[model samples]
Target chain A: MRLKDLGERALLARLAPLGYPPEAPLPPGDDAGGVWAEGRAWLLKTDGFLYREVALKGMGPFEVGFRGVAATASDLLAKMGRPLGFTLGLFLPEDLEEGFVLELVRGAAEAAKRLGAFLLGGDTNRGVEVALTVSGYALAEAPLPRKALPGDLLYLAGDRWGRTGAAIRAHYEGRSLEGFPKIREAAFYPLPRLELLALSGLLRGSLDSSDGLAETLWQLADLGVGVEVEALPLYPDVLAFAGSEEAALELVLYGGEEFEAVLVVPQEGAAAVEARAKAKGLPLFRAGRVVAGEGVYLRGAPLPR
Target chain B: MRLKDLGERALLARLAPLGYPPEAPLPPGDDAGGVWAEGRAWLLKTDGFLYREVALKGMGPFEVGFRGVAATASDLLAKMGRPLGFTLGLFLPEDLEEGFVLELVRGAAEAAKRLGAFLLGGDTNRGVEVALTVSGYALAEAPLPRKALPGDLLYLAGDRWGRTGAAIRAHYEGRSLEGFPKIREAAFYPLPRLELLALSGLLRGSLDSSDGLAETLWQLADLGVGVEVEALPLYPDVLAFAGSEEAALELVLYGGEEFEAVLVVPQEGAAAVEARAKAKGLPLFRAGRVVAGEGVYLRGAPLPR
Candidate 1:
């Protein structure tokens, strides 16, 4: 059998029975897994980045390292845990330049420091391509997963959408990034929403938009609930670049790697969540609400399954 | 600058200040880092393996996976810690077969079970080469990290060595494995000395001979102590295959990937440590004693530094 036939999910399912302990609060399927130790919940999250998959043509080692750290850090932030430290696994090409490698480490170090975490220890090996695996831990009193209860209001913790998708489209179409600097920068070096989410204290559940809003909604839907999106948080520049409301909506729904938090706030605490974002001067968008159903609905119409 | 110029140690030094906490008991320079958490000493180790480097021609995915797990698990055992769980990071080629991938995971799962550890959570990415990074944690009442005292006796936990190195040379030379099946098997699926070390709690310091016995001795010497080897423990097969006493001693001293423990037992506890191994049906060889000096010595002569 080939991997294409089994698919990523099936492959993961086959290996699901390997490590998770019975006492673990959250298992392998969540953004991060939690094990109760030392009188507190310890959050464990591992994320990998492949050079070919994440790198653009002009992207340097620093940007690559930053993305890798931010992406992994985002998972810890999604759970409302303050990251303690991270271990990096770097697979470098045999002929990789030493300076490039140091730059990669420096970038990861800088990003880790920015989030109030440190690089603990990791492994390095020689391979044909650059690949990194970062494992991190944090302490959480009550770590959140994608459990959006009925009557929960869904809000985005940062820019609405289309920025990353727009940047990627521009890169592939051989267009200059001069006009979409924010979008391009968002695609390159996304700051994880650790600070904002940690300060809010109002999130019932949350996850990052690394897999696009539509997929994130589907994930929340898997908890036996659906989302009723009253408004699509589309960026003005994205709307203009996409040239139509429908096209912009497509980007907002399907685009990925925004690295922003999609927060599930209780109806009563929704105001406080928005207020906290305002006090922090961070972008907050009220996108939708949790409804007692399956499948996401936009303006009273169900999106195709 | 290329990696050849910076080297692994220098590269690691540049990234040393990134993650380790000031209170960390053991830092990045040891076999694994030690962090005190959960009211117990926690040992953290991450190791990566590349297919082209570790895989033999006929070596299957199962053995590759098994080696990966065992090698990482061995680091925890080196510290005399009981492994709790491990996270696997697999970087697989796009064309990797599904059955092979599953077998690889099964190999790791089986190894983890043997050590009473489980695979907790990990990451998988698509890359051009087959690579695996296993990050593991273990609990220790008192973690050991090459802190050899002057009055300590040195011992080998398993066979005298040269088995793995001989097996690799044979494979690369296209020689038959007819006479050295044990050596070849040791090369492919080296079992870690976790059980023996965990049972016998007499080690003052310890390290594995994954990077050759000479290198391990040098590590011990770094703690301001030296070793005086009275006898060289060479496996009968390794001795016979080498066809001379000097050659056999060379293999026993300088060859790598033995995956056996080189333990430092205090003089008073040496007898009890030996007795424990005897009761457990494990091999134990008293090779030498820790001396108040630097560098390793054979008999009265110092081995070249």
Candidate 2:
């Protein structure tokens, strides 16, 4: 888009992921449904990050943009909100390559469409660093707003873990993941959304673990039900890549950006929910259950919130 | 608020309008209805800017936050949408004061409440400049999306003009508004929402002139209608303050931030429309109507688009 004008008025004229590699199924209701929640309650969610904070090494502008939507959508999907569309806030840095900016938008659009949501457009302003804030509204008949009750079963639903955490470790240690392709790929790409929406209907409560699994469990514990993890998913790829069990365990507990959901299911419905997870080809890990207590515990010890 | 922060996840954790003076009536529909559009289509509006681009020299974080909501609401209002709530995407600058951040948020919440809309929570990220992107979804019966036709009557709806432009002029030239209190106040705070919602039911198409009067008209003209401005509101304060008619004309035509609306009304019911505008205490001025042609014209000559 070239500047098409004269003076004054003319100068102003020129505008303008998660879990496993399962075969993603497009909902038959894609784009056919109206964006209006209509009679349903509004599920509003906004999430964002500066490039330096969220964009990992080897992550192109496209990858950054793709994760931007996924991270934001993760919040909504946790609450069982069906995101019909998205509004983005893009802040561009000075001297940014034009190709980078264009690729960023294309990647976001591509990601949103894949999730069956529309990127309805947003505000773009010039700033000192690259940043994006994604906001979306979804219609939810009943949002699972972390209503974790006693006897509720907590499930970590995703294909893998410690991948994103390991990726960050490599970056900080100045090591490349090239030697370990599985680590590199999982770390870089991670799992897709992993049928979180399909599992939403069965969830009693849910919270996204973008921050870290332990941190997510700690927050889940605060819904008045004490969270106790008897087993954390120890991915084989992660264990092998770390070259030690201890290093892999560190990544599993404390590393962030998992982009998975720790779902709460009633103990009565746990088996069927797990079955549905299997049906959808999503991996289901029965981490533990909530008790009539306080604080997140690992077997018998407390984990800091 | 002092350092509840520790490190790692703890360090990451800590978080966190316009219009004229009227007796400002709040619609009884305030918070009474659901935010969902249901059968209604979505009216999503997002607007933002770098702090330096839009925040005035004398403006505080409160006013900046206030205007941020107003400017964004102006878009939804121009479309005749009933705003239910807002979601803000805040990009905070480095070394920003805690008071400023707190004040900015308080200002936004205050302004949102005044307009009968909720300031639902949003995303905040670290950056090198203070930026706010306000995105709101309003339910629409029929949005007045600039459907300007040949025989439509064009009207300018607001109390005053050129005050913001004059305020800017004083800012850059290092002049004082000491002698012109009205100009200062009007520039600082012009019309309130001004029954714009009350006027929404009677309009055909509309657009907000946050850019300036002439630019707004030029946009309205692009709907395949030749805009002719026979009457431009020249306020007594602006005329006398500028000290000359010609300079006053410059501010009116070229200077920006008017925050008024250029409304397209049907020629058939012009009186009743004007009468209704008066009924709501909103001053309505009849500019020349659109013709079966193109280009924005002032008394028959072309004005830059």
Top candidate (TM-score): 1
lDDT of 2 by residue, B97-154 (tens): 5556666766666666677666655656666778878777777665565567888888
Q: Alpha carbon lDDT of residue B282, candidate 2?
A: 74
Candidate 1 structure quality by residue, lDDT tens digits, B1-305: 67766677677767766656677756556777757766666676778888777887668888888888888788778777777677778887767898888788888877888887777767777777778887777777777766788888998887637787677666767876678778877877787766555443577878877878887887778779878888877778887777888887777777777777888989997778888888887788888999887888889787654
Q: What is the lDDT, from 0 to 100, of the residue B84 in candidate 2? A: 64
Best by lDDT: 1
Name model 1 segments beyond 4 Å from true: A17-19, A179-181, A196-204, A240-244, A266-284, B17-19, B158-160, B176-185, B196-204, B240-244, B266-283, B301-305
Per-model C-alpha lDDT, please? 0.76, 0.66
TM-score of chain B of 2: 0.83
Residues A1-305, candidate 2: write the lDDT tens digits: 11121221222111001110112111111111112235565655567788788767788887777777777676776666766666667777656655666667666666677776656556566677788887776666655666688888878878547887888888888877776676666545553473776776677777778778887787676556788888887788778767898899788888888877788899889889988888887778998888998899888888875
Quote the positional error of residue A75 for candidate 1 in Å: 1.4
After the best TM-score superposition of candidate 1, give how far the Cα of residue A101 lies from its true spot, in angstroms.
0.5
> What does the lDDT read for residue B121 in candidate 2?
59
Q: What is candidate 1's lDDT per residue for A5-91, written digit by digit as tens?
A: 666767776776665667775656677766666566667677887877787756788888888888878877777777767778898
Clashing pairs in 2: A18-A191, A18-A192, A19-A191, A38-B38, B19-B191, B19-B192, B20-B191, B20-B192
Each candidate's fnat, listed in order, reads 0.59, 0.21
Maximum-DockQ candidate: 1
